[PDB]
Amino acid sequence: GHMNITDIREQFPILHQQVNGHDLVYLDSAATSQKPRAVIETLDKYYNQYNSNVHRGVHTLGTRATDGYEGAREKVRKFINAKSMAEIIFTKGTTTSLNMVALSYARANLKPGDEVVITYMEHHANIIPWQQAVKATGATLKYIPLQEDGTISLEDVRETVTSNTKIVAVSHVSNVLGTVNPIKEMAKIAHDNGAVIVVDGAQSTPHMKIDVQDLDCDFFALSSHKMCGPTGVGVLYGKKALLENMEPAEFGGEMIDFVGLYESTWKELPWKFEAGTPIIAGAIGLGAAIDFLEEIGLDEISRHEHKLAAYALERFRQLDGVTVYGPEERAGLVTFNLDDVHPHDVATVLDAEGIAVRAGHHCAQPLMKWLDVTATARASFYLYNTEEEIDKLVEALQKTKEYFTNVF
């Protein structure tokens, strides 16, 4: 049962190379994750053996491609514990999923005086679609405040959500702070006030079990590329009764039933929301990523990331002049700054040592402003990373601090 990190790393060809003369140390999985051979070879087999368009079922390869595509829909349903494949919509990624809710749910259900409630830690994907939806409807956007450690208190949620709130939208896991938000209790507060809750799960799904029946979220969005799967593919989950009453966000072939000159009728769910030839190979590859993660065990992967996170926080606390943002209890990532060194220069120096991290605002400018910084650096961990890699990171941070103090 227990995961062998050597055996896991063996499955990721891209980890086994040098950058600038040093073994690669890839600590940027919160930006995008690497892929095991089981996923890459799923794409290969699709294109080598049974590519064809789907949902015709009139010739043999087309039936195979259809069975592969719809089979992957069912894999996703089981993976997040949705009641029904009608609730599982394949999209281009988390961002498009959230935009579909903002176009098809928010803009149809917001009036002046209604509120959309988000938080200061949201990724832009979970901010801009609501800014545009409230502007288009004359509704009001509101922000739940954060505690000093970058978590959300339920009393602040209760204070911000009111009888005029129609939508609460919030991240399951922050890509910057590592905070795991109390989604299940926030959904109960949202429903008690007459609101739906929209959960941005791009950063939770790769790393921890999702059960949308236990969360009782109304909508849940995720991206394949962060969870060992292909780029260009994501999921929107929504409760069937909500999706049934929402109009499509996109129109075209495959999502219609009858097309007249001026009027058309739509397919049943989920295909109502899948216009045009779908992301056939990428969805099948996302199903393979799910099989891969489930065979390792999401709970095993969470325990491994908890170990790496606690080890990294401890070793970061051994460095002088380094500031870490966010709470002690966290997902597998550390966002930080070195005193006196711009995080872009940190990242540049670290890449010269083979170490890949991210520097910038991480698509969370209002959070940087809340943190009173212009930018930060971020190291993020996944199921193929090790404590030795964190040692290399903290050693390179120490030698970065020494380098820049002495150039001065």
Next chain:
Amino acid sequence: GHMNITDIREQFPILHQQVNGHDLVYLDSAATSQKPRAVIETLDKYYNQYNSNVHRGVHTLGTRATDGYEGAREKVRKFINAKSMAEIIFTKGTTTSLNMVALSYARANLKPGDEVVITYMEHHANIIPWQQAVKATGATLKYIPLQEDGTISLEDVRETVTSNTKIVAVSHVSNVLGTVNPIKEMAKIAHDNGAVIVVDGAQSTPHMKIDVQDLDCDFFALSSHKMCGPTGVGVLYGKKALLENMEPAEFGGEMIDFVGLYESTWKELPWKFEAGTPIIAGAIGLGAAIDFLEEIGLDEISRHEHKLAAYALERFRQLDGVTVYGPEERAGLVTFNLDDVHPHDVATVLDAEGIAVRAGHHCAQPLMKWLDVTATARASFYLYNTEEEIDKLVEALQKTKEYFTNVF
């Protein structure tokens, strides 16, 4: 220079297999095309060697992925002869591209009394977004009529387009009739009346050179999966001056410049229209499909398809009780019916002989109604198909006709 079909077919692993005990005869490339090793191995190399998120440029693999993604944008620009990469937007496919024009251009620029003009041969992707855009604006949808052979006469275009027309949307090549429409002359008519022209090029781009400066189209949409490229990726081309004045269709990270609590500003083109982590691998694979087709020569591929089309029409005319739809001059496809046999049964019997064709409405229900049929069968050709494969098709059609006459 001249293409060797044996050497071309050698590059497509999927062609070399049996279905039901017969060599595969894949005649469904108008639904989706197969991929050469150069494309599949491009995806492999991406995932094996340099996957990372794009447009950070802070670590070595991220710079490589960015250079690959933006390099593919430039490959597409050269391929359709656009003036600028600002004009090349990566989307999920033709359908999404056309929906982006309908959301961001049509719904912003249509008033009561304005007209959107389409044709009776359009694919649903080029029909439903306009039905929805005119309903949302109170504008009027109009249809250019067709000649008896399923072509469009320019005098009918001139009669249908008026001083109230703001948009003409039309396919470059019909996926059913094989008609090549007179796009360049239609664009001059559209502009003479104060309209833009939106060209659905999903079926022309795989098969013939596109030059958007010579066409003078305002928007042009295409899909990677029909042109030897990965699924899940497409392009929207639009004249820079039009795109500059259109608002994004999707909102999120990557397409912003500044994000405040309530207001945001957008990136320059093309990234204004690319919200969230992009279709990194698929776009790079579409660039490889372009390199592959350009090395063979689109003019060579067009000549090969013209030969196969003229051969197929002749051999179809040798069959009794078979009706072919559309004009003599055509792209590489034949849509037909057997007297007395439902096209679904034709397709089923043909798959038992290893032959893959499509039966149905081909996402063109108003065209089937114009043709006074409920469904049709369709065989479609690409650069790996041969005359021997067309012989197998017409022989299997003859034996289908004999089989069903004798069961009766």
